[PDB]
Short mmCIF file of C-alpha atoms and ligand atoms in Angstrom, two decimals:
data_model
loop_
_atom_site.label_atom_id
_atom_site.label_comp_id
_atom_site.label_asym_id
_atom_site.label_seq_id
_atom_site.Cartn_x
_atom_site.Cartn_y
_atom_site.Cartn_z
CA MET A 1 94.61 102.19 123.47
CA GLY A 2 95.75 99.83 121.18
CA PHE A 3 96.36 99.94 116.98
CA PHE A 4 93.59 97.72 116.13
CA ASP A 5 91.11 100.18 117.97
CA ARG A 6 91.59 103.12 115.44
CA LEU A 7 90.61 100.14 112.78
CA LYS A 8 87.27 98.79 114.11
CA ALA A 9 86.48 102.37 114.52
CA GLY A 10 86.96 103.45 111.01
CA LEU A 11 84.85 100.51 110.01
CA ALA A 12 82.18 101.42 112.60
CA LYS A 13 79.83 102.79 109.75
CA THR A 14 80.36 99.99 107.88
CA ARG A 15 79.69 97.18 110.48
CA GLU A 16 76.89 98.51 112.29
CA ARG A 17 74.24 98.48 109.47
CA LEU A 18 73.77 95.26 109.64
CA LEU A 19 76.76 93.03 110.27
CA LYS A 20 77.03 92.88 113.74
CA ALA A 21 73.30 92.02 113.94
CA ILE A 22 73.96 88.93 112.46
CA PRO A 23 72.32 85.97 114.56
CA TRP A 24 75.32 83.41 114.03
CA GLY A 25 73.53 81.09 116.04
CA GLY A 26 70.06 80.87 114.31
CA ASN A 27 69.63 78.41 111.17
CA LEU A 28 71.94 78.51 108.54
CA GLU A 29 69.18 79.77 105.76
CA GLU A 30 68.87 82.89 108.40
CA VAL A 31 72.16 83.61 108.80
CA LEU A 32 73.29 83.25 105.32
CA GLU A 33 70.08 85.71 103.98
CA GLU A 34 71.01 87.95 106.63
CA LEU A 35 74.99 87.67 105.54
CA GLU A 36 74.60 87.97 102.06
CA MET A 37 72.59 91.65 102.55
CA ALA A 38 75.50 92.76 104.56
CA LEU A 39 77.76 92.15 102.28
CA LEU A 40 76.05 93.36 99.26
CA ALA A 41 75.09 96.40 101.60
CA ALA A 42 78.60 97.06 102.51
CA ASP A 43 79.91 97.07 98.86
CA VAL A 44 81.77 93.37 98.65
CA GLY A 45 79.90 93.14 95.28
CA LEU A 46 77.54 90.28 93.88
CA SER A 47 80.10 88.50 92.65
CA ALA A 48 82.35 88.14 95.80
CA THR A 49 79.43 87.68 97.88
CA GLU A 50 77.86 85.21 95.90
CA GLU A 51 81.31 83.11 96.18
CA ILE A 52 81.75 83.70 99.65
CA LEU A 53 78.51 81.89 100.19
CA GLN A 54 78.98 79.06 98.19
CA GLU A 55 82.34 78.31 99.76
CA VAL A 56 80.60 78.52 102.66
CA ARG A 57 77.70 76.48 102.27
CA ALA A 58 79.06 72.94 101.18
CA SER A 59 82.57 73.37 102.06
CA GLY A 60 82.23 75.98 105.38
CA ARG A 61 82.07 73.47 107.89
CA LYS A 62 84.54 74.83 110.62
CA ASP A 63 82.31 77.14 112.24
CA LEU A 64 79.69 79.20 109.94
CA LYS A 65 81.61 82.63 111.47
CA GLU A 66 84.83 81.23 111.11
CA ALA A 67 84.59 79.88 107.50
CA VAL A 68 82.93 82.96 106.91
CA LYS A 69 85.78 85.00 108.22
CA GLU A 70 88.75 83.13 106.83
CA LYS A 71 87.20 82.89 103.41
CA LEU A 72 87.07 86.76 103.44
CA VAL A 73 90.58 87.00 104.55
CA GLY A 74 91.68 84.74 101.86
CA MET A 75 90.01 87.02 99.71
CA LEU A 76 91.90 90.03 100.67
CA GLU A 77 95.38 88.35 99.92
CA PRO A 78 96.87 88.21 96.31
CA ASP A 79 100.39 86.71 97.15
CA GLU A 80 99.84 83.21 98.04
CA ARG A 81 103.00 83.28 99.73
CA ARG A 82 101.72 85.42 102.45
CA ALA A 83 98.77 83.60 102.74
CA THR A 84 100.76 80.53 103.25
CA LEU A 85 102.65 81.96 106.05
CA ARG A 86 99.30 83.00 107.61
CA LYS A 87 97.35 79.86 107.36
CA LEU A 88 100.44 78.51 108.84
CA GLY A 89 99.74 80.90 112.22
CA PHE A 90 102.36 83.62 111.36
CA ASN A 91 100.18 86.81 112.90
CA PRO A 92 102.08 88.97 115.26
CA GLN A 93 100.25 92.34 116.60
CA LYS A 94 101.54 95.06 114.68
CA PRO A 95 101.89 93.77 111.01
CA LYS A 96 105.14 93.87 108.94
CA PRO A 97 105.82 97.48 107.45
CA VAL A 98 105.28 98.06 104.16
CA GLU A 99 108.49 98.26 101.68
CA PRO A 100 108.61 99.30 98.77
CA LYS A 101 110.46 96.99 95.98
CA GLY A 102 112.41 99.74 94.84
CA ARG A 103 113.36 103.70 95.47
CA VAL A 104 110.25 105.19 93.18
CA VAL A 105 106.40 105.15 94.10
CA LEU A 106 104.38 106.65 91.29
CA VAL A 107 101.36 107.70 92.68
CA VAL A 108 97.97 107.50 90.46
CA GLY A 109 94.52 108.45 91.26
CA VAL A 110 91.53 110.49 90.08
CA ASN A 111 91.43 114.33 91.18
CA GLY A 112 90.25 114.55 94.60
CA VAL A 113 90.82 111.23 96.20
CA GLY A 114 93.63 112.49 98.28
CA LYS A 115 96.84 112.12 96.74
CA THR A 116 98.59 114.78 97.99
CA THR A 117 97.47 114.04 101.49
CA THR A 118 98.35 110.37 101.31
CA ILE A 119 101.83 111.05 99.84
CA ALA A 120 102.34 113.58 102.75
CA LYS A 121 101.11 110.75 105.58
CA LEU A 122 103.45 108.35 103.73
CA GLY A 123 106.30 110.71 104.35
CA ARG A 124 105.62 110.97 107.45
CA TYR A 125 105.31 106.63 108.09
CA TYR A 126 108.43 106.25 105.86
CA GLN A 127 110.63 108.88 107.77
CA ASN A 128 109.85 107.48 110.72
CA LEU A 129 111.00 104.04 109.22
CA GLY A 130 114.70 105.44 109.19
CA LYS A 131 114.49 106.67 105.11
CA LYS A 132 115.34 109.46 103.36
CA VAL A 133 112.07 110.64 101.59
CA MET A 134 111.74 112.88 98.73
CA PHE A 135 108.96 114.11 96.69
CA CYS A 136 107.95 114.75 93.16
CA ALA A 137 104.72 117.67 92.54
CA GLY A 138 103.73 116.03 89.02
CA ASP A 139 100.18 117.55 89.00
CA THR A 140 101.70 120.97 88.79
CA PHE A 141 98.03 122.68 88.58
CA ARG A 142 95.66 124.66 90.75
CA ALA A 143 95.10 121.26 92.38
CA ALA A 144 94.71 120.95 96.55
CA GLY A 145 92.60 121.79 99.58
CA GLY A 146 94.43 125.08 99.67
CA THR A 147 97.43 122.95 100.86
CA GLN A 148 99.81 121.64 98.05
CA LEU A 149 102.35 118.85 98.30
CA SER A 150 105.17 121.65 98.14
CA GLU A 151 103.85 123.08 101.88
CA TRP A 152 103.57 119.76 103.20
CA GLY A 153 107.20 118.96 102.02
CA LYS A 154 108.45 122.09 104.20
CA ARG A 155 106.22 120.83 107.16
CA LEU A 156 108.06 117.30 107.24
CA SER A 157 111.22 118.69 106.14
CA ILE A 158 111.08 116.44 102.76
CA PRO A 159 112.54 118.09 99.61
CA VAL A 160 110.01 118.60 96.70
CA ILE A 161 110.68 118.76 93.24
CA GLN A 162 108.23 121.48 91.51
CA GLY A 163 108.32 123.67 88.66
CA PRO A 164 105.70 126.36 87.65
CA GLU A 165 102.36 125.41 86.25
CA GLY A 166 102.05 123.66 83.09
CA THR A 167 105.60 122.46 83.48
CA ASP A 168 106.10 119.10 81.72
CA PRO A 169 105.53 116.59 84.49
CA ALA A 170 107.71 113.86 82.84
CA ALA A 171 110.64 116.22 82.70
CA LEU A 172 109.96 116.81 86.11
CA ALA A 173 109.88 113.49 87.29
CA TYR A 174 112.79 112.76 85.41
CA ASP A 175 114.53 115.68 87.35
CA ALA A 176 113.69 114.08 90.74
CA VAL A 177 114.99 110.82 89.92
CA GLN A 178 118.12 112.06 89.09
CA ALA A 179 118.23 114.01 92.13
CA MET A 180 117.10 111.32 94.18
CA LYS A 181 119.96 109.30 92.98
CA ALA A 182 122.59 112.11 93.23
CA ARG A 183 121.92 113.32 96.57
CA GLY A 184 121.06 109.45 97.66
CA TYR A 185 117.46 109.61 98.59
CA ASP A 186 116.02 106.43 99.87
CA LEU A 187 112.41 107.01 98.48
CA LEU A 188 110.77 109.18 95.77
CA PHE A 189 107.19 109.68 95.62
CA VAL A 190 106.09 111.14 92.59
CA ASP A 191 102.57 112.30 92.49
CA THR A 192 100.49 112.93 88.93
CA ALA A 193 97.64 114.96 87.58
CA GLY A 194 94.18 113.15 88.17
CA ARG A 195 91.84 115.33 85.65
CA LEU A 196 90.12 112.99 83.40
CA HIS A 197 88.49 115.14 80.90
CA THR A 198 91.24 117.97 80.25
CA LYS A 199 93.22 118.94 76.99
CA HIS A 200 95.84 115.97 77.90
CA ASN A 201 94.76 112.89 77.46
CA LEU A 202 95.30 111.65 81.24
CA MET A 203 96.51 108.16 80.44
CA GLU A 204 98.91 108.93 78.00
CA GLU A 205 100.30 111.28 80.25
CA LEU A 206 100.90 109.01 83.27
CA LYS A 207 102.62 106.49 80.56
CA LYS A 208 104.69 109.39 79.58
CA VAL A 209 105.99 110.09 83.14
CA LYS A 210 106.35 106.47 83.79
CA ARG A 211 108.72 106.32 81.05
CA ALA A 212 111.15 109.17 81.94
CA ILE A 213 111.32 107.60 85.27
CA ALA A 214 112.76 104.35 83.97
CA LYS A 215 114.71 106.40 81.43
CA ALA A 216 116.46 107.96 84.12
CA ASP A 217 116.60 104.81 86.14
CA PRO A 218 115.40 101.55 84.34
CA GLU A 219 114.20 99.41 86.86
CA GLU A 220 111.83 102.32 88.20
CA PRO A 221 109.57 102.95 89.20
CA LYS A 222 109.00 99.34 91.15
CA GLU A 223 105.72 100.46 92.81
CA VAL A 224 102.78 102.41 91.19
CA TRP A 225 100.27 102.98 93.62
CA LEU A 226 96.40 104.17 92.98
CA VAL A 227 94.79 106.08 95.70
CA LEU A 228 90.73 105.31 95.97
CA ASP A 229 88.28 107.24 98.22
CA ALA A 230 86.45 104.40 99.76
CA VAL A 231 83.31 106.99 99.76
CA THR A 232 83.32 107.05 96.13
CA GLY A 233 82.61 102.90 96.52
CA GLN A 234 81.01 101.19 93.74
CA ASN A 235 82.61 103.19 90.97
CA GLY A 236 86.20 104.40 92.30
CA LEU A 237 87.10 100.69 91.26
CA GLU A 238 85.80 100.65 87.77
CA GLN A 239 87.89 103.84 86.85
CA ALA A 240 90.70 102.03 88.79
CA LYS A 241 90.83 99.28 85.87
CA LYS A 242 91.82 102.13 83.27
CA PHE A 243 94.49 103.09 85.34
CA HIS A 244 95.61 99.48 85.76
CA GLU A 245 95.49 99.27 81.87
CA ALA A 246 97.89 102.37 81.69
CA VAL A 247 100.55 101.98 84.17
CA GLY A 248 100.52 98.37 85.81
CA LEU A 249 99.40 98.94 89.58
CA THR A 250 101.32 97.43 91.96
CA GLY A 251 99.10 98.32 94.78
CA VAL A 252 95.90 100.33 96.17
CA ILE A 253 95.77 102.49 99.15
CA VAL A 254 91.96 103.28 100.13
CA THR A 255 91.15 106.37 102.22
CA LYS A 256 88.19 107.59 104.38
CA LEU A 257 87.09 104.08 105.52
CA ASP A 258 85.65 105.88 108.33
CA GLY A 259 83.40 108.22 106.35
CA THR A 260 81.18 105.43 104.15
CA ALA A 261 79.17 102.43 104.98
CA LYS A 262 81.11 100.90 102.02
CA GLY A 263 84.36 99.26 103.76
CA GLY A 264 83.45 96.06 102.18
CA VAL A 265 84.53 97.49 98.62
CA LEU A 266 88.14 96.54 99.69
CA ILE A 267 87.10 92.90 98.59
CA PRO A 268 85.98 93.39 94.78
CA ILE A 269 89.21 95.71 94.54
CA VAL A 270 91.82 93.07 95.54
CA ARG A 271 89.82 90.44 93.42
CA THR A 272 89.56 92.79 90.13
CA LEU A 273 92.83 94.28 90.31
CA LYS A 274 95.21 91.49 91.67
CA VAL A 275 97.38 93.60 93.53
CA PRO A 276 97.41 93.94 97.45
CA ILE A 277 95.84 96.94 99.22
CA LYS A 278 98.64 98.50 100.82
CA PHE A 279 97.08 101.39 103.44
CA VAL A 280 94.15 102.09 104.61
CA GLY A 281 92.86 105.39 105.72
CA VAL A 282 91.00 105.13 109.52
CA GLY A 283 90.78 108.78 109.77
CA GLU A 284 92.58 112.15 109.19
CA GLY A 285 95.20 111.78 112.06
CA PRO A 286 99.16 111.28 111.04
CA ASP A 287 98.86 107.54 112.47
CA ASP A 288 95.41 107.25 110.97
CA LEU A 289 96.98 105.98 107.33
CA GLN A 290 97.69 102.21 108.40
CA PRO A 291 99.63 99.57 106.88
CA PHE A 292 97.12 97.12 105.67
CA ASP A 293 96.07 93.84 107.49
CA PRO A 294 93.77 91.31 105.90
CA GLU A 295 93.08 89.16 109.33
CA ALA A 296 92.88 92.48 111.34
CA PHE A 297 90.60 94.08 108.69
CA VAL A 298 87.89 91.02 108.59
CA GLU A 299 88.05 90.89 112.48
CA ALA A 300 87.20 94.72 112.75
CA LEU A 301 84.62 93.94 109.88
CA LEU A 302 82.74 91.25 112.12
CA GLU A 303 83.39 92.54 115.59
N1 GNP B 401 90.12 111.71 107.14
C1 GNP B 401 90.46 111.57 106.09
N2 GNP B 401 90.86 112.35 105.01
C2 GNP B 401 91.24 112.05 103.96
C3 GNP B 401 92.03 111.06 103.66
N3 GNP B 401 92.35 110.84 102.37
C4 GNP B 401 92.22 112.17 101.86
N4 GNP B 401 91.38 112.94 102.56
C5 GNP B 401 91.36 114.36 102.33
O1 GNP B 401 90.41 114.27 100.95
C6 GNP B 401 91.02 115.59 100.41
C7 GNP B 401 91.78 115.44 99.39
O2 GNP B 401 93.16 115.09 99.23
P1 GNP B 401 94.06 115.99 98.03
O3 GNP B 401 95.10 115.25 98.79
O4 GNP B 401 93.74 117.27 98.05
O5 GNP B 401 93.60 115.63 96.77
P2 GNP B 401 94.37 115.01 95.30
O6 GNP B 401 93.60 113.77 95.17
O7 GNP B 401 95.77 115.08 95.48
N5 GNP B 401 93.62 116.05 95.02
P3 GNP B 401 93.89 117.76 94.28
O8 GNP B 401 94.28 117.47 92.99
O9 GNP B 401 92.53 118.61 94.59
O10 GNP B 401 95.01 118.63 95.19
C8 GNP B 401 92.26 116.36 101.57
O11 GNP B 401 91.76 117.84 102.04
C9 GNP B 401 92.12 115.15 102.49
O12 GNP B 401 92.09 115.69 103.69
C10 GNP B 401 92.12 109.83 104.60
O13 GNP B 401 92.13 108.93 104.99
N6 GNP B 401 90.92 110.46 105.91
#
């Protein structure tokens, strides 16, 4: 049964191309050559791959396989504090559940990455951790796979703040924070537009929605999570940069790991944006959106 199982399976396409075939017993030069190709071919990026090799050549004298494993895990953790408790030995089965710093999670990403679907899964997740959850449909448009955020709300018995198409989304977000406060909800997930080439500059609208939320609640939002589709790989991180510059990301959710051989992309993401990966999507099941665990992630990558 297990949980670690779904993760290993989600990384199957990624692992099976070259990683699992690396002969950790042959002489360095051969295992490193194979290593670098497998990293690059999995979208780790030349920058991180190069660093990995260097840290492994002249420093990685603990067991090549281990030196590698540990460097990769080190690269998946931005928060020194957590890497410390780890170096020490903290590592139970199920990782600590993700806790938002505040009550408002602003969700961003390009159209079609899966923000609506992810929000639905995050509602379920949090509702089982015993939290009052509310949704805000900030992308008030013809956006969805025929399933609006509104529908998912009814299904999960989560209230959805919504308005007619074209409604001012800042005003929508503002209302949602007020309704959250007034009715005492634990967490509000605010969804947003994702089209980069419409008549309203996207980054400006996101900045405007964040302003409105704080205006209604000064310290909010304490989380701004960007959703990225692993299938997009290489460029989904590029665009991610722009989002980071406009509204300050505190986190990233990567969906569809299972549909690409580019699952190594989690490395350049964390290194480039300097925020942690919060959840990873390993399938389309309700429990397929897992809380990220560097250690377990890397183990799955290499076994
Ligand atoms: N298997 C799987 N499918 C996913 C995952 N994340 C997103 N999807 C799918 O990708 C599609 C895009 O999701 P959606 O929530 O509609 O994206 P958006 O980013 O909100 N796009 P839109 O603006 O069209 O509403 C959905 O049909 C959803 O099933 C994941 O981790 N795993």
